[PDB]
Amino acid sequence: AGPASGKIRAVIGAVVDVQFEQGELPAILNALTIDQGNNQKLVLEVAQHLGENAVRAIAMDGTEGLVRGQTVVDTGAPISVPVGRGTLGRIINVVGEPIDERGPIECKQRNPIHADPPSFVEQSTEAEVLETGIKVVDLLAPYARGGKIGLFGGAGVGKTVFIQELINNIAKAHGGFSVFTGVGERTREGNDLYREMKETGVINLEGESKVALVFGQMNEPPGARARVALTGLTIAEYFRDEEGQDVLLFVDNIFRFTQAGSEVSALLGRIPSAVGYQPTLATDMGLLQERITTTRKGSVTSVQAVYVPADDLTDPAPATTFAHLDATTVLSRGISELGIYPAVDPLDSKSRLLDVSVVGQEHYDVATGVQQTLQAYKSLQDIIAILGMDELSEQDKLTVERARKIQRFLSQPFAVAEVFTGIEGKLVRLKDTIASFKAVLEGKYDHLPENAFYMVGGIEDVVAKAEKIAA
Amino acid sequence: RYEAQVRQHEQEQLASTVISKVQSELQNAKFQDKVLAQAVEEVERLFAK
Amino acid sequence: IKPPVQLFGLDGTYATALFSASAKDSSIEKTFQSVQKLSSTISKDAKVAQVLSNPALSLNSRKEVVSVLSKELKLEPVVSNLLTVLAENNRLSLFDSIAKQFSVLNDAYNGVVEATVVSAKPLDSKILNRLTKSITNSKYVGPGKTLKASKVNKLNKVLSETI
Amino acid sequence: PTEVSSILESKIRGVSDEANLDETGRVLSVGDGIARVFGLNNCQAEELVEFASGVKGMALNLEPGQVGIVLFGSDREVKEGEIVKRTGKIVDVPIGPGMLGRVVDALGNPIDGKGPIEATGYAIAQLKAPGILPRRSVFEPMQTGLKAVDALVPIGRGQRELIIGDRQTGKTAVALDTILNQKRWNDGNDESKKLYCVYVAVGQKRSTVAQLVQTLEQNDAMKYSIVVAATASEAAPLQYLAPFTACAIAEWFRDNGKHALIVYDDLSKQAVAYRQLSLLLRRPPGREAYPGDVFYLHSRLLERAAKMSDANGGGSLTALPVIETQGGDVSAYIPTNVISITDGQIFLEAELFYKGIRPAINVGLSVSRVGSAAQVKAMKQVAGSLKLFLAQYREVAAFAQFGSDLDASTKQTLSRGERLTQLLKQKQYSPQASEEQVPVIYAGVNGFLDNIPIERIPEFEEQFIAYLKANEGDILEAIRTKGELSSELLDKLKSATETFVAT
Ligand SMILES: Nc1ncnc2c1ncn2[C@@H]1O[C@H](COP(=O)(O)OP(=O)(O)OP(=O)(O)O)[C@@H](O)[C@H]1O
Ligand SMILES: Nc1ncnc2c1ncn2[C@@H]1O[C@H](COP(=O)(O)OP(=O)(O)O)[C@@H](O)[C@H]1O
Ligand SMILES: [Mg+2]
Ligand SMILES: [Mg+2]
């Protein structure tokens, strides 16, 4: 066979320059195999070409043990991954290998991780709402079916708990298959997510599974973290185009894809951008977000989670992802310390399905009335810290009491957060959340206390908590 | 929409079969294609000089 | 005297600077055969190639290679001065680039170049390029030309854009 | 019709018959969009190139040994040793009246799937702006449809109005309502009153461009509006040249006798694409990781949209660039450069959008450099008195929390200022004409709306507009045709508003 054999000439970090022959050099985004001492291999993706029969490749694993002059064979194509129904229930890696100790993935076809996105003529617009179960998600920013969802938040606010609670009540009852592709996560978060799906019926080792697991946390190098988003999206794109199913891609976190490319951008010969980022920030983020859309063959509801750098939405990795998402669930660090579980911002979160032609005329008035009462309470709270409560009249006194009870009523106890809260998990529907918010804004629950709505469900749980606390 | 999809599918299927037959004929050592390539290069260079 | 051949500007200026002083009193024909003997006795020899990539040298192993490849080789004019300028400036590792740029100056000002189809063309040393291309294409197409890609790729791309 | 596939196969059979003139140079290195092409001595600056795989390029860094060309596609198709070809021309795009109704890309190719485009000319992307002798004063009025935009910062034909704002605060909402409000003039026969829109979506995703084109086609607004599709999934050369390609196609209407309106959405996405290609071409950077020509890149494309004089044709071109700010800071790096070069900027805060102001337009921060010279005479009479009442009520708005200590002059300014701000709030995709906005502004500035409540301001806007179209139809039609108000129009408008305010 005519295998393109190359010789290693330089190795500094994750970047490794391979020197091949004239004319037989590989192209960009090509997987390069390398024989090591163990039974595995060293996958290397070609990034650019320096010239003189040499191309700089980025290793997807540990670069320790490579000498100057080793054999580097080329696969001829890109990083192939296993697709189809065989990848459901198994823990795949960035190169398409199993990491669950359950044998090899018996797949009939293997698609590449590098592929072009959809065109403008193949796009299919929609305006369908998706019920999640939370009271603050079904009234403020509603999630769109088949669109991109972004859960923005800082460190320790509630980004990992938001993606786990929504998958246990939407992905477990959906018709399609899920695709949990974690990029830049932790070592303990990968083992806890696989054990929770087996006890609920999402991943069956002896039956049928509907959730694709893609490993790749921060324990590897910079090459495996940047290629974890392309390997996980290749399996979910085949089920919506070839099979025609509503796939659900869960990325955790979405901010780790942009930070992984900037770690090896300095050694590849590129100048740094702003805040120590790469110059191709808008080009690399747009090529992967446009491919996870909804076409004419099927839909794809992406529920990624963005991580803000030390609670800052004006960064280059957080502001660039806000234009490629329909519903944005931004979280604040100030609401999480007061007792709101979770810290859902009622004014910073916006969505495209929050109109009167998609949710109706009755649901549009409740969303506008709750946002006006919460925004007016911020201006009146500044005058009470210097003048006091004597400056408030009859209308300002009733608005301060109604704003505190409405903020605690939207915080419901999640099912996955039962070990930290203690209470049981409650799930409210879309019709029960709109009827409970409209009755409290009119004056039907003004005599109740603020503790009856905190950590409760709908209108039925608020009336039972008030009678039990008074006895 | 059904008539346009049936017409586009028939034109795409006919173009794919014609492209496979043209590639299989050039790999069978076509004697007429090799002699026509040398005569086309000599006639183009004489017209520009 | 600078000839219009460009040839880069930083790396290709090594052979262009020495070509001005070597083009006097007919001293350009002897520089072609002497430059080929320096590259053939340092590449496929495995004897004097012990200081090609090392950073040692330093007078001792730097001036001994320029005197052994000029006195006992085939040099008597100003051919020995080319190796002394590259030894003090640390430029002995790229000896193939200095010898390849010297043969391109004699083939451009006294002959044709470029290409055409299949293999190479004829590269005549007449005068104009239009009168020499028409007289050499008719004699080379008949004699030989086995014709054993470009036309098949252009026809397939035009049919896919209209469908 | 009768074997339509046989007509296209016969016309595409003979085309390649004169392509034996070599090409240009080769390729030495390629990566991250860059392509070090070795050779091509006859290639000019900013010229189109072509690779051996089919990807196009633009040679912008002409060095001595090599030539830096920016590829417009993926870097996987180019390799070390590929042959390159020179087109011989500069970076141009198609223009003319045949591009109306189809979504084109950054190079002029149609992506909507409606066949070819009948281009009447070919204009370059990097074109010169108009001089100081071929420009006139802004006298024509640009009807946007909003009540708070047509009275406060009124924009005209030939000016540059910036659309600053934060994330989700009324940025693209002001540009979409102004292009859809021109259906009353483009559907008629007056060519001087029509204004062809030119939405240039740059930096947006694939789902955002498909949703905006579907909403304009349902309201009969996509037949005379150019769409420049430029997503972020392409190369950096295609997104950076989207502002230059959209300005060349819209300039053909202003040079003939028509009007145009460009909407560069957004201005923040165009600055990030130009800095990405310059950082990979071995160049020194400046402030905020930008090149040296950061202020000259946005001022050159905005100065070409001006109003010509009567000797040049009488056309004009509007530029609506949206500046996406970070967190409300209007004095940043890219925000200060676009506001200083434009003749006005519309600010949009995120705090006023959640209160009830639709859209959030701050009257104390947004202003127009043209003033009342580019507006109608009928709307200028009501906008003069409303400007003084809105400015005095904003500075005394802190006394609204203590209503039990108001005086005589303090109670009149608070009641009139609250009714004037709520009457200008309109819904999405609901623009008003010049005749309907002149009757609503006269009832709040005179004192006919002070007796109504604050909660009944939404019901009074639809009740007064519907009753004026059936009872006093002669007063609404005379204000739109003549465009002014005489002595007979002022007495008839005061008698009709007083009789309808008693019920
Ligand atoms: N005056 C208004 N009244 C009601 N809703 C509005 C108004 N203006 C904007 N909106 C809502 O805001 C949403 C986004 O509007 P727009 O497209 O103008 O901003 P955007 O481009 O989404 O902002 P960003 O680019 O920061 O996401 C729309 O879905 C629309 O429903
Ligand atoms: N519904 C909830 N109720 C109480 N605590 C919660 C809830 N959701 C999340 N938390 C807390 O938020 C913390 C999030 O931790 P971690 O996932 O490490 O950071 P991040 O959420 O930023 O990824 C957890 O320690 C958990 O105790
Ligand atoms: Mg987490
Ligand atoms: Mg926008």
PDB file of C-alpha atoms in Angstrom, chain A residues 6-93:
ATOM      1  CA  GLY A   6       6.506  10.879   7.835  1.00  0.00           C
ATOM      2  CA  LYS A   7       9.446  11.674  10.118  1.00  0.00           C
ATOM      3  CA  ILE A   8       9.170  13.700  13.325  1.00  0.00           C
ATOM      4  CA  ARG A   9      11.450  16.749  13.159  1.00  0.00           C
ATOM      5  CA  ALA A  10      10.163  18.974  15.986  1.00  0.00           C
ATOM      6  CA  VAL A  11       8.208  18.361  19.185  1.00  0.00           C
ATOM      7  CA  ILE A  12       7.442  21.175  21.649  1.00  0.00           C
ATOM      8  CA  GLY A  13       4.283  20.636  23.676  1.00  0.00           C
ATOM      9  CA  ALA A  14       1.167  19.518  21.831  1.00  0.00           C
ATOM     10  CA  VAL A  15       2.464  20.713  18.443  1.00  0.00           C
ATOM     11  CA  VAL A  16       4.603  18.187  16.557  1.00  0.00           C
ATOM     12  CA  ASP A  17       6.118  18.919  13.142  1.00  0.00           C
ATOM     13  CA  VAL A  18       6.180  15.887  10.829  1.00  0.00           C
ATOM     14  CA  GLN A  19       8.404  15.824   7.736  1.00  0.00           C
ATOM     15  CA  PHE A  20       7.204  13.683   4.825  1.00  0.00           C
ATOM     16  CA  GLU A  21       8.156  13.356   1.152  1.00  0.00           C
ATOM     17  CA  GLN A  22       7.548  15.760  -1.727  1.00  0.00           C
ATOM     18  CA  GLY A  23       4.028  15.360  -3.107  1.00  0.00           C
ATOM     19  CA  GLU A  24       2.938  12.718  -0.575  1.00  0.00           C
ATOM     20  CA  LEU A  25       2.226  15.229   2.200  1.00  0.00           C
ATOM     21  CA  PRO A  26      -1.151  15.077   3.972  1.00  0.00           C
ATOM     22  CA  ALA A  27      -3.788  17.790   3.902  1.00  0.00           C
ATOM     23  CA  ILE A  28      -5.207  19.834   6.779  1.00  0.00           C
ATOM     24  CA  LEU A  29      -7.376  18.203   9.461  1.00  0.00           C
ATOM     25  CA  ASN A  30      -5.927  14.758   8.716  1.00  0.00           C
ATOM     26  CA  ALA A  31      -5.392  12.074  11.350  1.00  0.00           C
ATOM     27  CA  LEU A  32      -1.783  10.875  11.603  1.00  0.00           C
ATOM     28  CA  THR A  33      -1.104   7.547  13.310  1.00  0.00           C
ATOM     29  CA  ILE A  34       2.034   6.876  15.347  1.00  0.00           C
ATOM     30  CA  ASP A  35       3.209   3.579  16.834  1.00  0.00           C
ATOM     31  CA  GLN A  36       4.145   3.866  20.519  1.00  0.00           C
ATOM     32  CA  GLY A  37       5.144   1.222  23.071  1.00  0.00           C
ATOM     33  CA  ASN A  38       1.674   0.260  24.279  1.00  0.00           C
ATOM     34  CA  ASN A  39      -1.215  -1.342  22.374  1.00  0.00           C
ATOM     35  CA  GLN A  40      -2.808   2.021  21.502  1.00  0.00           C
ATOM     36  CA  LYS A  41      -1.650   4.787  19.156  1.00  0.00           C
ATOM     37  CA  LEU A  42      -0.851   8.509  19.076  1.00  0.00           C
ATOM     38  CA  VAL A  43      -3.434  10.392  17.010  1.00  0.00           C
ATOM     39  CA  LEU A  44      -2.219  13.670  15.512  1.00  0.00           C
ATOM     40  CA  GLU A  45      -4.322  16.166  13.553  1.00  0.00           C
ATOM     41  CA  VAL A  46      -2.592  18.260  10.894  1.00  0.00           C
ATOM     42  CA  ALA A  47      -3.271  21.952  11.538  1.00  0.00           C
ATOM     43  CA  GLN A  48      -1.122  23.892   9.048  1.00  0.00           C
ATOM     44  CA  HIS A  49       1.845  23.326   6.729  1.00  0.00           C
ATOM     45  CA  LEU A  50       5.139  25.106   7.387  1.00  0.00           C
ATOM     46  CA  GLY A  51       6.561  24.123   3.986  1.00  0.00           C
ATOM     47  CA  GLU A  52       9.649  22.329   2.702  1.00  0.00           C
ATOM     48  CA  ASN A  53       7.904  18.933   2.823  1.00  0.00           C
ATOM     49  CA  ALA A  54       6.825  19.464   6.432  1.00  0.00           C
ATOM     50  CA  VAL A  55       3.504  20.154   8.154  1.00  0.00           C
ATOM     51  CA  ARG A  56       2.805  21.069  11.777  1.00  0.00           C
ATOM     52  CA  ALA A  57       0.508  18.550  13.474  1.00  0.00           C
ATOM     53  CA  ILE A  58      -1.300  18.798  16.816  1.00  0.00           C
ATOM     54  CA  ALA A  59      -1.198  15.684  18.987  1.00  0.00           C
ATOM     55  CA  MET A  60      -4.448  14.580  20.626  1.00  0.00           C
ATOM     56  CA  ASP A  61      -2.706  12.891  23.578  1.00  0.00           C
ATOM     57  CA  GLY A  62       0.554  12.815  25.531  1.00  0.00           C
ATOM     58  CA  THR A  63       3.612  13.866  23.533  1.00  0.00           C
ATOM     59  CA  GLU A  64       6.050  12.267  25.998  1.00  0.00           C
ATOM     60  CA  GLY A  65       8.155   9.500  24.459  1.00  0.00           C
ATOM     61  CA  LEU A  66       8.477  10.807  20.886  1.00  0.00           C
ATOM     62  CA  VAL A  67      12.008  11.053  19.499  1.00  0.00           C
ATOM     63  CA  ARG A  68      13.388  12.896  16.470  1.00  0.00           C
ATOM     64  CA  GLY A  69      12.954  10.630  13.458  1.00  0.00           C
ATOM     65  CA  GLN A  70      10.041   8.361  14.412  1.00  0.00           C
ATOM     66  CA  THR A  71       7.628   6.901  11.873  1.00  0.00           C
ATOM     67  CA  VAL A  72       4.398   8.872  11.379  1.00  0.00           C
ATOM     68  CA  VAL A  73       1.923   7.184   9.024  1.00  0.00           C
ATOM     69  CA  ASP A  74      -1.079   9.067   7.649  1.00  0.00           C
ATOM     70  CA  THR A  75      -4.603   7.650   7.623  1.00  0.00           C
ATOM     71  CA  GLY A  76      -5.554   9.527   4.436  1.00  0.00           C
ATOM     72  CA  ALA A  77      -8.754  11.057   5.830  1.00  0.00           C
ATOM     73  CA  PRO A  78      -9.792  12.942   8.990  1.00  0.00           C
ATOM     74  CA  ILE A  79     -10.537  11.733  12.529  1.00  0.00           C
ATOM     75  CA  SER A  80     -13.115   8.996  11.940  1.00  0.00           C
ATOM     76  CA  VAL A  81     -15.652   8.321  14.695  1.00  0.00           C
ATOM     77  CA  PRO A  82     -18.271   5.556  15.100  1.00  0.00           C
ATOM     78  CA  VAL A  83     -21.816   6.612  14.207  1.00  0.00           C
ATOM     79  CA  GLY A  84     -25.192   4.900  14.178  1.00  0.00           C
ATOM     80  CA  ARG A  85     -27.050   2.993  16.862  1.00  0.00           C
ATOM     81  CA  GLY A  86     -23.904   1.263  18.153  1.00  0.00           C
ATOM     82  CA  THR A  87     -22.562   4.400  19.844  1.00  0.00           C
ATOM     83  CA  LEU A  88     -25.563   4.692  22.188  1.00  0.00           C
ATOM     84  CA  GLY A  89     -24.731   3.568  25.718  1.00  0.00           C
ATOM     85  CA  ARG A  90     -20.951   3.420  25.211  1.00  0.00           C
ATOM     86  CA  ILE A  91     -18.342   5.951  26.332  1.00  0.00           C
ATOM     87  CA  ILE A  92     -16.532   7.146  23.208  1.00  0.00           C
ATOM     88  CA  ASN A  93     -13.356   9.236  23.131  1.00  0.00           C
TER      89      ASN A  93
END
